[PDB]
């Protein structure tokens, strides 16, 4: 009755508002589309958000690393593909590839997801009905994504904090803060000089604590190298980390 494995593949024509002040596809727009394609793929596998919710569990995004080889532009048509590559005790690993009409690999992403128990309020082994899934054959998996990158430990002790509040518009239809909201805050926090003169080549994301509607957060960053920046978003009150990241610029 259902196929054994699924490669989600979607064609999107870029809208004007999906492009930044330079005419390049914005990273939040891309990531939002990636999350949509990943959701459609999960549904085909019977591991969609609703499938999990109805068994009392939910997905959490832990790691996400997006590499932009070449930015598409207004009215370009792009092909977004996504699928699981491997499934282990606690994690599913999901790849994304974005192709130009050209065939050029415009962008790729790797991601790591865990399952949270709604009873236990904590990570649990992936239930059997998720362990059992077959990733698709005949795709070439992107390189491994380190679970705990070294920048996780970096100090932001002297980095100035900028305050932001979780708004209504940042809440998705699953009643959670959209993980893209954090990337938007992080991007707004980047030095004007860098924004005006460089583009992101890669953004590597480590998600820690969940935030809620109305939470106050602090956004920080530190120059790491001539073309890389580290970023931290944390709860202003508790001081708990919500997002840690590295951006590489070119």
């Amino acid at each position: 009755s259902n196929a054994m494995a699924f490669i989600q593949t979607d064609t999107f024509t870029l809208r004007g508002y999906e492009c930044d002040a330079f005419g390049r596809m914005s990273i939040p727009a891309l990531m939002n589309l990636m999350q949509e394609s990943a959701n459609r793929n999960a549904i085909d596998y019977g591991i969609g958000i609703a499938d999990l919710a109805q068994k009392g569990v939910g997905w959490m995004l832990m790691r996400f690393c997006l590499r932009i080889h070449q930015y598409p532009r207004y009215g370009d048509t792009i092909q977004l593909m996504t699928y699981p590559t491997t499934v282990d005790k606690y994690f599913i690993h999901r790849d994304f590839r974005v192709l130009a009409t050209d065939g050029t690999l415009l962008a790729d992403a790797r991601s790591t997801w865990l399952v949270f128990s709604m009873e236990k309020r904590s990570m649990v082994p992936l239930p059997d009905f998720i362990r059992q899934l077959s990733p698709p054959a005949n795709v070439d998996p992107l390189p491994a994504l380190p679970l705990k990158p070294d920048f996780q430990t970096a100090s932001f002790a002297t980095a100035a904090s900028k305050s932001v509040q979780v708004g209504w518009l940042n809440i998705d239809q699953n009643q959670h803060v959209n993980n893209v909201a954090y990337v938007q805050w992080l991007l707004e926090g980047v030095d004007s000089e860098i924004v005006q003169t460089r583009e992101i080549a890669e953004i590597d994301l480590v998600y820690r604590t969940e935030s809620h509607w109305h939470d106050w957060l602090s956004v920080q960053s530190v120059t790491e190298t001539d073309n890389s920046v580290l970023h931290r978003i944390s709860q202003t009150e508790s001081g708990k980390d919500v997002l840690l990241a590295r951006s590489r610029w070119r």
Copy 2:
């Protein structure tokens, strides 16, 4: 070589992130799509943003009133149509209609646009090549949109101000603040109680001053009636108005 008139018509399948915390299509997403369809229509007419820029003039959105008869939801397919209805000395009037697969009119919008001279830095009579355009025959124009609504004059003297800053993400690929950014700020400013218990039936927008990257703005609102709110966004420094609006809720 080109047709005499154009009805822009596009079919969009709603993505998850285009829906709010209640699963209803968000107004910013709809308005962004409307602006995209209006841009594609203008290009067919030879009055697109670039067409004007290359003659040293530009469009400004003055009035926009969106009525949502029924909110579409995730994965619904909607049909967005737009066209000019009339052209007069200074203004073009543009209608939008949004249809469900059903045929239901989900939403409509009316809008009024003027032409700004880049030499004069002020509104000018529409150039001949815009005056001459033929709106499409065989469409039923929505009711007239008052140029200067009475709420324009309302006092916000005692309404508390909330401070917001124009960010990089609010700048469009035409290097202007996206007019949707103001609606997002206005929406974030609405009483939590209202957001949690009502939906917008109509939002009526009057655009005044242009803002720029990094401008500080103040967001205010006042209860007008049991199901209506007035909103004001202004430049915190100069105190000049940027947006005045009425929302009706149901």
